[PDB]
């Protein structure tokens with residue numbers, strides 16, 4: 001069996017079928033566009049912090065720190081892609097390069113462990129809770145977020161070798177995920193009490209963005225197996241789709257999320 005590409009799904013397909021120049025180039029450009037948008041996000045949150053009352057600026061700060069970590073780690077992920085796979089002129093495809101370092105989703109997973117807590121935390125600086133304690137929500141978010149990403153990371157090891165383990169850890173991870181959604185809805189509901197109808201409208205959009213953007217991750221996790229073990233997506237197409245959904249998700253969950261919280265902060269601040 002394959003000793004080289006046993007690490008993850010990307011390595012496996014790279015070590016066996018290889019990637020068409022279209023698939024490799026597409027994935028390369030989408031990862032580059034990924035970190036490019038984080039760098040543009042970083043400068044947006046820096047330049048706009050003066051547009052919100054001091055009260056809300058901790059949200060804009062956390063957006064900025066998320067953009068820094070995202071840019072740096074997704075830049076690493078992009079380099080990790082182009083370095084891991086070299087062209088073979090004989091076969092006319094890209095294959096896992098033994099002389100390079102093997103492809104590694106650890107860059108993105110580490111980014112998640114850092115950003116998930118900050119992203120969950122930062123809404124508590126724009127909204128006021130009603131009947132819930134700030135510390136309780138914070139602790140619930142931080143714990144469930146860490147556990148979601150840790151169980152998810154553990155599950156990701158058994159992605160190729162043991163699908164039973166892959167899905168069980170994935171389901172454990174999904175349990176913590178559903179708890180986060182449940183608390184976030186509660187937070188957003190309490191957030192709507194006490195604010196103008198304009199601000200309640202933005203919180204509605206934040207909720208839908210949050211719900212969709214965050215649901216793309218377990219989608220991308222499962223992406224290789226959504227058509228079976230011999231399916232359309234058990235190929236370079238599964239790798240394409242996954243890295244594309246991860247990028248869409250990362251841009252929506254971090255950058256768009258942050259822009260809507262800043263907009264919320266602005267309609268709250270200086271608007272009477």
Ligand SMILES: *C/C=C(C)/C=C/C=C(C)/C=C/C1=C(C)CCCC1(C)C
Pocket residue numbers: 111112115116119148149151152153170171173174177214215217218221250253254
């Ligand atoms: C800035 C990056 C963000 C918001 C990352 C979010 C990550 C998740 C919501 C991932 C959760 C997962 C599951 C629900 C099950 C499978 C494993 C994960 C980690 C992909």
Ligand SMILES: CCCCCC
Pocket residue numbers: 150151154172
């Ligand atoms: C890594 C710890 C797993 C806990 C499962 C509930």
Ligand SMILES: CCCCCC
Pocket residue numbers: 033247248251
């Ligand atoms: C991968 C680009 C993200 C598109 C913004 C909605």
Ligand SMILES: [Kr]
Pocket residue numbers: 045046049060061064
């Ligand atoms: Kr900032």
Ligand SMILES: [Kr]
Pocket residue numbers: 042068071
């Ligand atoms: Kr940076």
Ligand SMILES: [Kr]
Pocket residue numbers: 065068069
């Ligand atoms: Kr950081």
Ligand SMILES: [Kr]
Pocket residue numbers: 072075
């Ligand atoms: Kr860099």
Ligand SMILES: [Kr]
Pocket residue numbers: 174177218
């Ligand atoms: Kr899920």
Ligand SMILES: [Kr]
Pocket residue numbers: 140141144145179180181183
């Ligand atoms: Kr939570």
Ligand SMILES: [Kr]
Pocket residue numbers: 129132137183186187190
């Ligand atoms: Kr809450």
Ligand SMILES: [Kr]
Pocket residue numbers: 019023024027236237239240
């Ligand atoms: Kr690919």
Ligand SMILES: [Kr]
Pocket residue numbers: 247248249251252
């Ligand atoms: Kr997106």
Ligand code: NA
Pocket residue numbers: 082083084085086087
């Ligand atoms: Na290469």
